Amino acid sequence: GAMAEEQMRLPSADVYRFAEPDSEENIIFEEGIPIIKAGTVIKLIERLTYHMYADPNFVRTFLTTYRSFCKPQELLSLIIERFEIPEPEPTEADRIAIENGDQPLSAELKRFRKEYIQPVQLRVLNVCRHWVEHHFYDFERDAYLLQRMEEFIGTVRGKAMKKWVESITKIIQRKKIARDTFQSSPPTVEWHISRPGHIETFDLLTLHPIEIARQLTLLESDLYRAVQPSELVGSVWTKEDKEINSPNLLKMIRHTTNLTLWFEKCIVETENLEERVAVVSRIIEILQVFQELNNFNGVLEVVSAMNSSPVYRLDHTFEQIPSRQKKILEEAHELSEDHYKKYLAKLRSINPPCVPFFGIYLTNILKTEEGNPEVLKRHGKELINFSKRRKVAEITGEIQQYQNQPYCLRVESDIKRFFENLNPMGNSMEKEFTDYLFNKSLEIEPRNPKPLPRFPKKYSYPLKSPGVRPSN
Ligand SMILES: COc1cc2ncnc(N[C@H](C)c3cccc4ccccc34)c2cc1OC
């Protein structure tokens, strides 16, 4: 019948793997264009380059997430095999015309070429164009992958495929060369005790708190904007090959660790109580400027530092902090309460520019990865859970909508370098250092009923803050 006629027009399974009938044993949809819930790698590839209709949403999500279930080298091989479609044999009337010496009719072959081979091959090139344009990192990481792609794209003889090879060749040309401006007047760079150039005197209390907040916001904005979606998929930042797969993500996390621990270090290594109060007060001022700038990443780094085991227990220090600053810390902490309800409402209400709290995306992605299975079972056969990947991809999409928000703030190279080079842990491991920090906390403020000892001053310069109002 017509169902068999439609199927038998496609190539046979002994010579082509991407043309078997769809069943519950190899592909399932959710509930227009149907959304793919799960399937085999073969069926995913077929639907990635489906002949009847274009599916740009599935292409975007596939190329973002595929590394969680398929290697880059394996993906190339599959789209090559998908491209290399075998043509059906001519009919008996047509076949005899060849050995006689005459041109056949070839109506079934022309229709197959028109409505299958050409459409499928068109979609494969669209995937290649999307791959090189939006995920070039794969090709620069694995040089052999690029040679194969260039070799494949080089050997595509076609009239209708001429524009696609030209466009794909244009992008690799740009990406090869890509290896090697304010709208308003930025405010004047602020200084306090440390002079411009005197980099050896740079410190928490010697730099201006306004400028610490500005330079950290510029730094963190750049780090936030550098993170690519694929770095977050499949928990690849916690796997063995984390440094190659998730370098921008790891830079973000390590900065957060180093800044947070540096705040804690600054506090507990200031053993004199009155000096430690000035240190804590200055960090709260830094948070106030983070809040002015809508650098929520920054705000919650300060909250983390203040809520840490060595700092949160310093009752004698926080007694001397003015109620106004206590309230600022309370309201900052309140952002995180009830699954970040207040934070999320604040982030949606504001206009650009901002730096979103990065930690929440990592938390939610880790929950999705751990909470959903890697594969679904149907009739004994395991199928790749694509909905799991799409949910992770949807979270990385939220990250991307805040990645084009540059600040109207001038960089200070020396202050930038200071914060880029922070190494509060030194040559200690993290657990060792955080044990040291808590042991330091116990020394400076012993647990009751032990007495509170006095300690000498370490700072020879004035501790009064210049405040957080900028000059004008
Ligand atoms: C559920 O337990 C908590 C409730 C909190 N409620 C409000 N704020 C917190 N943290 C802020 C950042 C903060 C830190 C340290 C000293 C502060 C002193 C006065 C005002 C705020 C302080 C909280 C922290 C908690 O555990 C860590």
UniProtKB/Swiss-Prot annotation:
One of its GO terms (molecular function) is protein heterodimerization activity. Residues 208-447 form the Ras-GEF domain. Residues 32-176 form the N-terminal Ras-GEF domain. Expressed in gingival tissues. It comes from the Eukaryota. GO terms for cellular component: cytoplasm; cytosol; glutamatergic synapse; GTPase complex; neuronal cell body; plasma membrane; postsynaptic density. It is linked to Fibromatosis, gingival, 1: A form of hereditary gingival fibromatosis, a rare condition characterized by a slow, progressive overgrowth of the gingiva. The excess gingival tissue can cover part of or the entire crown, and can result in diastemas, teeth displacement, or retention of primary or impacted teeth. GINGF1 is usually transmitted as an autosomal dominant trait, although sporadic cases are common. Interacts (via C-terminus) with GRB2 (via SH3 domain). Forms a complex with phosphorylated MUC1 and GRB2 (via its SH3 domains). Interacts with phosphorylated LAT2. Interacts with NCK1 and NCK2. Part of a complex consisting of ABI1, EPS8 and SOS1. This is Son of sevenless homolog 1. It comes from Homo sapiens. The gene is SOS1. The chain holds residues 565 to 1044 of 1333 of the full protein.
